[PDB]
């Protein structure tokens, strides 16, 4: 029969493999998208799956009755040290409702005015931390970003401090869970994965979940000495129930769902917060524009939450940050019944399906001419952006728990940074987006000359 | 009556040394002053000096025109780093006349008053540091104290912040310090000294060296950076002039007056707060007496300057903390010309005599029977302690131009830790001196449980 999908170059057995032998996959994948169209297919030795770029199709594949939420390889490999966490588990499987239904209470808006004390904390921190600095010394934005908020959800969701602004050094956990990250990639492109010659690198990957393992204990314990405190996700998942089974989750399960909030909860935001400040710097009238709205909100010394929420520009250029570059980016799908996408592209049962979110962001036909531009005025009305055309936290009910979160989050961290520093891109940085499964820009480096406001104690 | 000086068991061409084979040599000479009495002679390979250990002794020692400073071979070794600082320069020169002229402006109470927002500063840091630990975590107490002084000694003498608390691991100048004062201690006691196997050691020296004088230029660099703000010692340095010979200090000079106030300033410091702690988790109803004169006094969420100087308690603590183990634990003296000490000890133009302050501090026949008995009740009354009984800071023209500035400053940062937080030994801690040329406590840690009281911003500009 005749093909209806364009497909990359073919290079014999090892498929479409030798097109992802780089440090940047995902762009890579962006590349051959601008060549080949809004759908192609792609091969690898064992799967294939096909790629969607397009609002066209992806909002045919984000249709739940036709399509479900697949545990592509990057997560069915993740789950060796995260287990059967609420993001590696089936849809259908009652690991997810469980344990969703026990979660799910933790993200609800009051436990956002719950942990707003203590991410105003960790703000706290950072801004002190580069109050404090000396004359000619620069900020590395990725590394403090990863402080920020490893300290953040640490704090938050387990009443556990990482005191990451007390090192001079990333965290061992950090480093453990980079390694863990590119073990992880480089398996993913593995002709021969159960070669011999794979053994050293495999005994390096166990050490690494030793030191997840252990962090997790230290966790466990510290609650044994401090108690039940804030409603934050241990509460919960100790002494939570399912309203449906009546069962609260085991012990494994409570582990795998530390680790994995753990990972979660800090990595993607802190590219967030790099990328938002690597755009700002790079456009000095939106920089201006938001530091205005950030001197005009936040009046008092400590943000409150209804300040927070009165931060629209912030959040507008967050989530054109999260436009240019999603940094969690791509999620895949399987068709539950044989079905015909776009009126164009027959699928049958089962096939995969990935959606590569840049590109869905770079879709000229539903954003214009400018869709490379740093332009968050296009965020201004939120209804005249079509249907499933920003997905950068996914869709349906296995779209991000933590979505309300980040954004809170990092609007908070914004709007201190901008309300109590100016920036300035002292070495003309030239982007590069480092890949470990999830985006971050790497060497991002700014100098910030502080606006000498006040910061008390509350 | 003229009496035979006593002297410990001599061992050849080495005389007194092999007695001295130890990492704590002070302690050493402390027990032989104990076994052979108030004066006695030491040798060591190349140089003799006499330890006096007695009040009677040691008021005629301080006779400012009788004696005056010597450079003992441990001053002289730390001038290979330290260069001519202040406290490394004969008095009769005019290195230490011209230094004194243009720094003494820079610790009058006026200047206090200003290191008192910095000092703070740092204070809330270490208050900050140990609020946000986990719990069942312990408390490094040595460290903590390096971290907070050399912050401090920074931020007010040079306005450049170390961030000693944003680094996990000790900050590279203390580390180097720490190996160039053990590197002089262990020196003074080698019988070979040029043996080849210690020439690694040398080495390990001079790397040490660049180290400091990194950090000088930075500092250099940074001022002029920022310009003249705080008026602190750099300012005196730098744009000083000597109201007797209208001259300000040479660059040379510069450095080395910085290098030494940087150590100076911050490692027996470290030590009199290490001290003080340890004293009071092991005399709990001093650290309650103590704990309630602070909740008394700091009312404020932070300390202002006159709130520190009610701190009477506090003080009196600090000052018995100094009395049994003074940090910098002994001083030099030469003799201007012939004559008899104590009515009995015949001493020639130029011999060297040290005084052995713990000794002093625990002379029975000044301080009573309890002299190795913690009590900061002794100084209640400051006039009825004897004349030349109490010298932890020097004597005479050579005492410690920073007292005030480290008396204040311990003062402050000890009250906010009792303000804030209620210790406990949790491990029982047996007391170990650590000599590097200075004594500090090694290995003390105690756990801390906060208050739970709220603490004030600063504005840092
Ligand atoms: C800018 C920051 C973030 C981005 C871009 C992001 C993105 C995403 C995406 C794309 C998914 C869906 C993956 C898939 O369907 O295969 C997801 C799910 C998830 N996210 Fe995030 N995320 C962010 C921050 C966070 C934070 C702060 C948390 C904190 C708890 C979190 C926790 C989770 C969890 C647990 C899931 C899986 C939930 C489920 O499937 O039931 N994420 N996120
Ligand atoms: C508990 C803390 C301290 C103790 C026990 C102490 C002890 C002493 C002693 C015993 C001397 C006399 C040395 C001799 O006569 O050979 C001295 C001198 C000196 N100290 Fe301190 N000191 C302390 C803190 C400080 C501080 C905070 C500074 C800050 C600058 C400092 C700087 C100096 C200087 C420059 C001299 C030499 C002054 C001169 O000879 O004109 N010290 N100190």
């Not at 790099?274 to 009238?285: I, M, Q």
Request: charged fraction near 30%; proline fraction near 5%; hydrophobic fraction near 40%.
């Amino acid at each position: 029969t005749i093909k209806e999908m364009p497909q990359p170059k073919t290079f014999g057995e090892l498929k479409n493999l030798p097109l992802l032998n780089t440090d940047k996959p995902v762009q890579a994948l962006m590349k051959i998208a601008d060549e080949l169209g809004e759908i192609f297919k792609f091969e690898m030795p064992g799967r294939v799956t096909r790629y969607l770029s397009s609002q066209r199709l992806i909002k045919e594949a984000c249709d739940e009755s036709r399509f479900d939420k697949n545990l592509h390889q990057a997560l069915k490999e993740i789950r060796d040290f995260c287990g059967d966490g609420l993001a590696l588990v089936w849809t259908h499987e009652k690991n997810w409702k469980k344990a969703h239904n026990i979660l799910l209470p933790s993200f609800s808006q009051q436990a956002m005015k719950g942990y707003h004390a203590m991410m105003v904390d960790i703000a706290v921190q950072l801004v002190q931390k580069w109050e404090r600095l000396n004359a000619d010394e620069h900020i590395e934005v990725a590394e403090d970003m990863t402080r920020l908020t490893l300290d953040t959800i640490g704090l938050c969701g387990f009443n556990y401090r990482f005191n990451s602004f007390y090192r001079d050094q990333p965290h061992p956990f950090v480093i453990s869970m980079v390694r863990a990250l590119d073990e992880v990639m480089n398996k993913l492109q593995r002709a021969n994965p159960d070669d011999p010659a794979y053994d050293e690198n495999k005994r390096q990957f166990q050490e690494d979940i030793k030191v997840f393992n252990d962090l997790v204990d230290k966790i466990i314990a510290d609650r044994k000495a401090r108690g039940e405190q804030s409603d934050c996700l241990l509460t919960q998942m100790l002494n939570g129930k399912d309203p449906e089974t009546g069962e609260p989750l085991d012990d494994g399960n409570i582990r795998d769902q530390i680790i994995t909030f753990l990972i979660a909860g800090h990595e993607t935001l802190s590219g967030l917060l790099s990328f938002a400040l690597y755009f700002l710097v790079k456009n000095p009238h939106v920089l201006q524009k938001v530091a205005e709205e950030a001197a005009r909100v936040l009046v008092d010394p400590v943000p409150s939450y209804k300040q927070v929420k009165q931060l629209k520009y912030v959040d507008m250029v967050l989530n054109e940050a999260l436009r240019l570059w999603p940094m969690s980016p791509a999620f895949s799908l399987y068709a539950k019944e044989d079905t015909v996408l776009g009126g164009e592209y027959p699928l049958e049962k089962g096939d995969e399906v990935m959606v590569l979110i840049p590109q869905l962001h770079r879709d000229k036909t539903v954003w214009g001419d400018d869709v490379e531009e740093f332009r968050p005025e296009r965020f201004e009305n939120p209804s005249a952006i079509p249907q499933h055309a920003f997905k950068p936290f996914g869709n349906g009910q296995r779209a991000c728990i933590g979505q309300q979160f980040a954004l809170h989050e990092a609007t908070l961290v914004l709007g201190m940074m901008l309300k109590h520093f100016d920036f300035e891109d002292h070495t003309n940085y030239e982007l590069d987006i480092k890949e470990h499964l999830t985006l971050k820009p790497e060497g991002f480096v700014v100098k910030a000359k502080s606006k000498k406001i006040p910061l008390g104690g509350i």
